[PDB]
Design a protein around this ligand. Structure first.
Ligand SMILES: [Mg+2]
Lengths: 675, 125, 514
């Protein structure tokens, strides 16, 4: 008998055991696909979908820039960047009609935000391009570097605190012809501007551009918040509802005759198509009848993205067979380089992009880099779902559904089959007019009752229950006291938010405790396992009357289960503790705590702090010149002692003269007089 | 000739001077160990890495007056080692357990009322 | 009154970042400000080509064809350590419980075997210096006896940097970086040719390897820590699910592979950061309680580590992997492409047929790994969670329809049998226990043979499955570019034996599913 797990689906429906079709559950050990060759394919394909549009030369950048929008309608089904301003605004107009006040009100709440928001906020985030040192770096370090330049150049408004003032400096920085940083390093206005508008490897953006992207997504949030169809930014179980709602809406009205089909949606090349200029058109229509200052700050992000440049990482690696060499050609001089070094597939990719290549960066006016305007792009998506109401269709077919960035789910109703087919086409084509290209490959359609949306698999009213990304249920590496609280908190939170099943949480708890005890050598007192702590913990175990009192870090039993996980361990076991044990555990005269004034922990002896240069390496390398020594002796008097021994052994065997022996003994007494 | 002339150069810089006269040959391996776990950058390992060491935990120097140097089995509980900022010393997790079985007992009647915010989660269950 | 302004360099960008026709942000602003809708969409819909459509090819029981698996020479074993072929020298270590010293655990195991032959090569590595693989094994045996020469016995062993080891670990095979200003013109200098990975055909062994993964052993391979007494009703149901599963998975081979994963990758990472520039010997150890229940240590073989000055998570550690086996490499040589197998001694095996003398082999191969791939192997216990959650999620789901928890029925109805296999007669069902181990093996192999090819095939095939499910639900399923979906699935089927079996498993299902 040959085992084939997939044969389960002969008995179990696929939605029930969909859990078995996710191979990893966790980030795998490769995530390959971010080469220099991969960046140039994004740059090419971004232009290839948008290639009939108007080419302009940028005055400030001096960069070839494609503008596909208000361009020629597609006559094929290939992805089109050719959006239509009149269509977008109309979609956004009919949204504000269908949700009266949505924009005005959402602007009022965002005008509250933009002022109150602090520069502090900008330090939170992933890798960022640091234009100060022309490298990728941590977010907080990239800002410290950027304010250090803005401090050196007359741009001290950032040091007021609020973010809007840091932007005011970023604005004034563009107008300045010189840009100087004491690292003195000098950038002309053109070279500065390239780096201010750079995306570096898909690719992270500069610190200048990031500021504005927040306030836009902030506005895009307040909108999404007010829309039922938007699947962002709502929580775990809160979202499963939205799936139930949209079916229940389209299936209770539906009489005997009226058909209903759900299409499991996924949009193709989402980022490479829809153009920054279109987002500017959206923002300006939302912020009509609003103050100029608010209109402006929000307008800045799309503008920068329409003028942006994509750096091609580092470059390509070469290799000589016979000679046994290898060399790394950078991106900067990949334009001014010979093509006969490269292969057949790589040449064409460089020959296509070279027209766009300006100062070692490729101009990219159309499209975007992944997950940047997630929320705003969702508004646009919803505005097309919005146009499926009986009124806007003006036909016997109508539609509704759910959208979150590129993923969507669409329910089309009509009195007959041809009606459904029509309603689908009308959605598919209305989508093309705003740069949204449904993926024919990825997508499918079936009678309403089953579908997928954001990997929630709906089947006749039930969505399958499994966590799709489990976190490291191991130790957190703070100390005994904290890690327990964190680890137990991490599981509870993964049950309520991430839809983690109980039996799995119990085993998750077991594997944590196992790791916890191994890490901190704090195996239960009654067990026989040997560590350094085994003795101390057993002496405490024997001493202690009520052992259920003892914390896991004191060789106590694990009392946690589903119900407890919210309680801190110290509280949980508080009644069961011996008077003297508790007396010591919490005595804040103890030498381990320091202070005693998102995890909840009582301060005990377990709340301890573990241990935390070119001057350390210099001393260690010189020690190797002496020993290619006694344990208690210091470095200098085990170096000065080895010198006099080699001095008097090389004097006997006759290696150094009387002159070179007297010189060593003289210097060996100058080192001893500094000690 | 060149290596002993170089040692006189490093003892003229008063920062490199105070790493040569303080540090011992035994306590070079202990300085190098925990920097091999900072390359790991994953804190879960960095902890497992440190718990392997004899004395990973830091404490006030008053511990040396409070708990003994060795326990009944003759295990060393702390060491007179150099810590970064001040006159804190290095301590084995044995010492924490030792304290929790032989330490001084203060009266913990105020702890249900100091941590009331925490303790109230138990009352509902 | 807050006032933020666009001027200078920004205004010229603002004016250039508009639709065509508009030469001025203020001009455009005014267009939008005073915009009112005028059936612009309804209009441009009629203007657009009718060739731009989403016509629905209906998915019938006739439309889907079996996936096409590639042709080529048979696929090779690419796992770090041996799986079903692996062999272990075991000691019973009762009195000493808890974390010991691996070096000595190995030597103690080694000393239980008194059958070592003069080692000779049986099936060489076509693309390698085979005499070096033999010298390395002799060096291990040699340097292990040299510890019993040392005045004070060492914690770990560092192999002497011989020619054969320097070779195997790739020492001085990285060429020197030469500034392109200096080697400007070189007449054999081409880029790192990322060649089309030559396609391989699905061999039998991968299925054999997996069949053996689903089997039980005479050894508990996991011992999980305690848990709070059950109180709430959910806690009683939870513990029931867990324990029933934990019971049938306890002794499953897959779980041995999980432990082999953890111990080896753990020991390799600790060495990679401890003895950075030493060629450390790293014994391949696991532990289990016997069927009677005594703590038993196992030695599978050795790994010699290269230089490991690791800065990044991607940075590589070259290692050699000498692993004991009873399996003759001449039976399925296509498997052992990457391996040079020696014949290093004779075992006696007290089987059903009295006792039989068999030869002992040593599957030696060159190999590498990174902090990320080691961590991956160290976190392989998650396979247990992944496996339990699949079982737990099904129960949760099958219970929803009835409204009552089916935890008891599933596990206790010993008549209730799940389809999980095929045989010459046809589709065979098994126990819920067989399903647990089968689902565990899947999670483990998904880890062991983790590839981007798998990621892809998993994601794209999922769609085809869900479509087929809709066809079985009689929900009039329809596709938009079904030929496009197949091309995307088949694009993933190149040479990976695991992804190829999963595709064979699909075709196998798709025939019965209709
Ligand atoms: Mg989808």
């Amino acid at each position: 008998m040959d085992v084939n797990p997939t044969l389960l689906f002969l008995k179990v429906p696929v939605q029930n055991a969909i859990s078995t079709t996710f191979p990893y559950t966790g980030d795998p050990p490769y995530s390959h696909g971010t080469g220099t060759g991969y960046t140039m394919d994004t740059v090419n394909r971004t232009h290839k979908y948008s290639e009939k549009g108007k080419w302009t030369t940028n005055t400030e950048t001096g960069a070839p820039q494609l503008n596909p929008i208000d361009g020629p309608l597609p006559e094929d089904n290939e992805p089109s960047g050719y959006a239509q301003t009149d269509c977008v605004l109309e979609a956004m107009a009919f949204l504000e009609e269908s949700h009266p006040g949505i924009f005005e009100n959402s602007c009022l709440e965002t005008m509250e935000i933009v002022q109150q928001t602090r520069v502090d906020k900008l330090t939170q985030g992933r890798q960022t391009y640091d234009w100060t040192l022309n490298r990728n770096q941590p977010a907080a370090t990239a800002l410290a570097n950027t304010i250090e330049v803005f401090r050196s150049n007359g741009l001290t408004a950032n040091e007021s605190g609020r973010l809007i003032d840091f932007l005011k400096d970023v604005m004034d920085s563009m107008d300045k012809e010189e840009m100087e940083i004491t690292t003195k390093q000098r950038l002309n206005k053109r070279s500065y501007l390239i780096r201010a508008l750079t995306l570096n490897t898909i690719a992270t953006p500069g610190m200048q551009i990031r500021g504005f992207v927040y306030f836009v997504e902030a506005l895009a949030r307040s909108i999404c918040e007010k829309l039922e169809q938007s699947g962002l930014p709502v929580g775990g179980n809160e979202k499963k509802a939205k799936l139930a709602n949209v079916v229940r809406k389209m299936m209770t009205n539906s009489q005997d005759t009226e058909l209903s089909f759900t299409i499991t949606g996924d949009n193709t090349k989402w980022n490479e198509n829809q153009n920054p200029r279109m987002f500017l058109a959206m923002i300006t229509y939302i912020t009509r009848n609003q103050p100029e200052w608010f209109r402006n700050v929000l307008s800045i992000a799309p503008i920068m993205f329409s003028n942006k440049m994509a750096r091609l990482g580092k470059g390509y690696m070469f290799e000589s067979k016979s000679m046994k060499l290898r060399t790394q050609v950078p991106a900067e001089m990949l334009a001014n380089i010979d093509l006969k070094y490269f292969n057949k597939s790589t040449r064409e990719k460089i020959e296509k992009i070279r027209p766009l290549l300006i100062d070692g960066t490729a101009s990219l006016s159309p499209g975007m880099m992944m997950g940047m305007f997630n929320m705003l792009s969702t508004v646009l998506g919803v505005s097309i779902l919005n146009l499926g109401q009986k009124k806007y269709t003006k036909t016997t077919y109508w539609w509704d559904g759910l959208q979150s960035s590129d993923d969507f789910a669409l329910i089309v109703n009509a009195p007959n089959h041809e009606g459904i087919q029509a309603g689908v086409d009308r959605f598919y084509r209305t989508c093309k007019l705003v740069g949204i290209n449904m993926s024919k490959k990825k997508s499918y359609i079936n009678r309403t009752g089953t579908f997928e949306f954001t990997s929630f698999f709906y089947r006749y009213g039930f969505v399958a229950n499994f966590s799709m990304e489990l976190p490291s249920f191991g130790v957190s590496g703070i100390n005994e006291s904290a890690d327990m609280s964190v680890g137990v908190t991490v599981i509870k939170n993964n049950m309520i938010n991430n839809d983690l099943g109980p039996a799995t949480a119990q085993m998750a708890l077991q594997l944590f405790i196992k790791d916890y005890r191994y890490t901190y050598r704090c195996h239960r007192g009654d067990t026989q396992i040997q560590t350094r702590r085994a003795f101390e913990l057993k002496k405490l175990w024997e001493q202690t009357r009520s052992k259920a009192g003892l914390l896991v870090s004191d060789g106590g039993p694990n009392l946690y289960n589903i119900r407890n996980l919210h309680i801190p361990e110290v509280c949980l076991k508080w009644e069961l503790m011996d008077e003297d044990y508790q007396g010591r555990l919490c005595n804040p005269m103890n030498p381990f705590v320091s202070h005693k004034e998102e995890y909840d922990a009582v301060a005990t002896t377990h709340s301890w702090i573990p241990k935390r240069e070119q001057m350390y390496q210099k001393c260690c390398n010189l020690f190797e010149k002496f020993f290619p020594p006694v344990g208690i002796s210091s470095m200098v008097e085990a170096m000065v002692s080895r010198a006099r021994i080699d001095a008097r052994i090389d004097f006997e065997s006759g290696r150094i003269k009387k002159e070179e022996f007297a010189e060593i003994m003289k210097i060996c007494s100058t080192i001893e007089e500094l000690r | 000739m060149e290596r002993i002339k170089e040692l006189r150069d490093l003892m003229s810089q008063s920062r490199t001077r105070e790493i040569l006269t303080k540090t011992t040959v035994d306590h070079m391996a202990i300085i190098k160990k925990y920097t091999s776990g900072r390359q790991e950058k994953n804190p879960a390992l960095r902890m497992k890495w440190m718990m392997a060491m004899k004395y990973p935990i830091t404490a006030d120097k008053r511990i040396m007056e409070m708990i003994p140097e060795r326990n009944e089995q003759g295990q060393t509980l702390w060491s007179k080692t150099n810590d970064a900022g001040s006159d804190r010393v290095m301590v084995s997790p044995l010492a924490v357990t030792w304290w929790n079985r032989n330490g001084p007992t203060t009266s913990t009647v105020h702890y249900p009322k100091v941590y009331k915010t925490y303790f109230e989660k138990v009352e509902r269950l | 009154e807050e006032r933020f302004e666009i001027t200078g360099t920004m205004r010229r960008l603002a004016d250039q970042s508009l639709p065509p026709n508009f030469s001025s942000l203020e001009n455009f602003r005014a267009y939008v400000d005073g915009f009112e809708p005028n059936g612009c969409i309804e209009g441009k819909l009629s203007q657009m080509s009718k060739e731009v459509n989403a016509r629905i090819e209906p998915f019938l029981r006739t439309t889907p064809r079996p996936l096409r698996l590639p042709d080529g020479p048979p696929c090779s074993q690419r796992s770090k350590f041996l799986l079903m072929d692996a062999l272990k020298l075991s000691i019973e270590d009762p009195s000493h419980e808890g974390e010991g010293i691996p070096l000595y655990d190995a030597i103690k195991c080694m000393k239980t075997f008194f059958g070592w032959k003069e080692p000779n090569i049986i099936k060489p590595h076509e693309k390698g210096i085979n005499p070096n693989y033999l010298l390395t094994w002799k060096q291990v045996l040699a340097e292990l006896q040299d510890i019993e020469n040392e005045e004070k016995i060492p914690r770990t062993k560092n192999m002497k940097k011989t020619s054969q080891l320097k070779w195997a670990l790739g020492e001085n095979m990285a060429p020197e970086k030469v500034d392109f200003e200096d080697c400007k013109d070189v007449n054999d200098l081409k880029q790192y040719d990322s060649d089309e990975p030559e396609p391989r055909s699905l061999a039998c062994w991968i299925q054999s390897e997996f069949n053996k993964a689903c089997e039980l052993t005479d050894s508990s391979w996991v011992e999980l820590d305690e848990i709070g007494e059950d109180v709430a009703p959910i806690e009683h149901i939870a513990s029931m699910r867990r324990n029933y599963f934990t019971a049938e998975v306890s002794h499953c081979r897959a779980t041995e592979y999980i432990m082999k994963g953890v111990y080896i990758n753990t020991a390799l990472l600790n060495a990679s950061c401890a003895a950075m520039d030493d060629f450390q010997l790293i014994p391949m150890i696991s532990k289990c309680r016997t069927k009677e229940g005594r703590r038993k240590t196992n030695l599978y073989g050795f790994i010699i580590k290269g230089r490991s000055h690791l800065r990044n998570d991607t940075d590589v550690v070259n290692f050699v992997s000498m692993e004991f086996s009873l399996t003759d490499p001449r039976l399925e040589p296509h498997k052992w492409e990457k391996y040079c197998v020696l014949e290093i001694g004779d075992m006696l095996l007290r089987t059903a047929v009295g006792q039989v003398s068999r030869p002992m082999f040593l599957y030696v191969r060159t190999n590498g790994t990174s902090k990320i791939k080691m961590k991956w192997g160290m976190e392989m216990r998650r396979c247990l969670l992944q496996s339990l959650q699949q079982i737990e999620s099904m129960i949760e789901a099958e219970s929803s329809v009835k409204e009552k928890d089916l935890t008891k029925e599933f596990f206790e109805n010993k008549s209730e049998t799940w389809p999980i296999g095929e045989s010459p007669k046809g589709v065979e069902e098994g126990s819920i226990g067989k399903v647990c181990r089968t689902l565990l093996a899947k999670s483990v192999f998904n880890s062991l043979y983790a590839s981007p090819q798998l990621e892809g095939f998993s994601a794209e095939s999922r769609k085809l499955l869900l479509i087929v499910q809709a066809l079985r639900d009689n929900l009039e399923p329809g596709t938009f570019d079904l030929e496009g979906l197949y091309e995307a699935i088949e694009e993933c089927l190149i040479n990976d034996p695991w992804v190829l079996l999963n595709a064979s498993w699909f075709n196998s299902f798709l025939t019965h599913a209709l």
